[PDB]
Scaffold this motif. Structure first.
Motif, short mmCIF file in Angstrom:
data_model
loop_
_atom_site.label_atom_id
_atom_site.label_comp_id
_atom_site.label_asym_id
_atom_site.label_seq_id
_atom_site.Cartn_x
_atom_site.Cartn_y
_atom_site.Cartn_z
N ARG A 85 -0.89 8.55 1.81
CA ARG A 85 -2.61 8.42 1.86
C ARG A 85 -2.77 9.84 2.18
O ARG A 85 -3.75 10.12 1.74
CB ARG A 85 -2.91 7.49 2.85
CG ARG A 85 -2.22 5.92 2.64
CD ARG A 85 -3.22 5.04 3.37
NE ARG A 85 -2.92 4.96 4.96
CZ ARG A 85 -2.07 4.25 5.42
NH1 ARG A 85 -1.15 3.34 4.96
NH2 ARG A 85 -1.97 4.28 6.73
N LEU A 132 1.33 5.92 4.87
CA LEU A 132 0.62 6.88 5.52
C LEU A 132 0.94 8.40 5.26
O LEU A 132 0.23 9.25 4.98
CB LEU A 132 0.61 6.72 7.06
CG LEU A 132 -0.26 7.70 7.84
CD1 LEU A 132 -0.55 7.03 9.28
CD2 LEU A 132 0.30 9.16 8.00
N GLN A 158 0.79 -1.08 -0.09
CA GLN A 158 -0.02 -0.03 -0.01
C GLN A 158 1.01 1.12 -0.07
O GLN A 158 2.24 1.29 0.33
CB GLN A 158 -0.90 -0.03 1.26
CG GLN A 158 -2.11 -1.06 1.42
CD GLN A 158 -2.74 -0.84 2.65
OE1 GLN A 158 -3.70 -1.88 2.92
NE2 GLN A 158 -2.28 -0.21 3.57
#
Ligand SMILES: [Mg+2]
Ligand SMILES: [Mg+2]
Ligand SMILES: [Mg+2]
Ligand SMILES: [Mg+2]
Ligand SMILES: [Mg+2]
Ligand SMILES: [Mg+2]
Length: 51
Positions: free
Chosen positions: A43, A40, A37
């Motif tokens: 994101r 953070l 992914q």
RNA sequence: GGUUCUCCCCGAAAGCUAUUUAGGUAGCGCCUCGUGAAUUCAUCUCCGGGGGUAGAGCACUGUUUCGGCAAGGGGGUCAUC
């Protein structure tokens, strides 16, 4: 001093476990890797400016 | 694939989530070490709780057999202005 016999407690694996990235020579993921992914700090959005 | 001396103390996981991910990895769960903190935590007794599972049941949703009552429907005979 890892990998210096049974009695040392860090032999035959050097504290690296069994056949992971941490057990490979030069192995391991970069800073901020979250398994695939976007981390953070990617994101979340950027804000502000430096004065 | 391999990783070389010794002793002592504690002691796992093979789960969740996500991933061009599924023989990789990250966070959490679990392990260890250190520093703090409360009659904090666990077990039992008693008390106060929400269940709707097992079981059971057939009012409801459906399903199922028999009997009674019985419209209605189908078939035959007359008549079918
Ligand atoms: Mg060991
Ligand atoms: Mg190995
Ligand atoms: Mg490993
Ligand atoms: Mg022990
Ligand atoms: Mg692979
Ligand atoms: Mg039941």
């Amino acid at each position: 001093r890892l990998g210096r016999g049974i009695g040392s407690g860090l032999g035959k694996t050097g504290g690296r476990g069994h056949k992971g990235q941490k057990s490979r020579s030069g192995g391991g993921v970069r800073r901020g890797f979250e398994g695939g992914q976007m981390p953070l700090y990617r994101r979340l959005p950027k804000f502000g400016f430096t004065s």
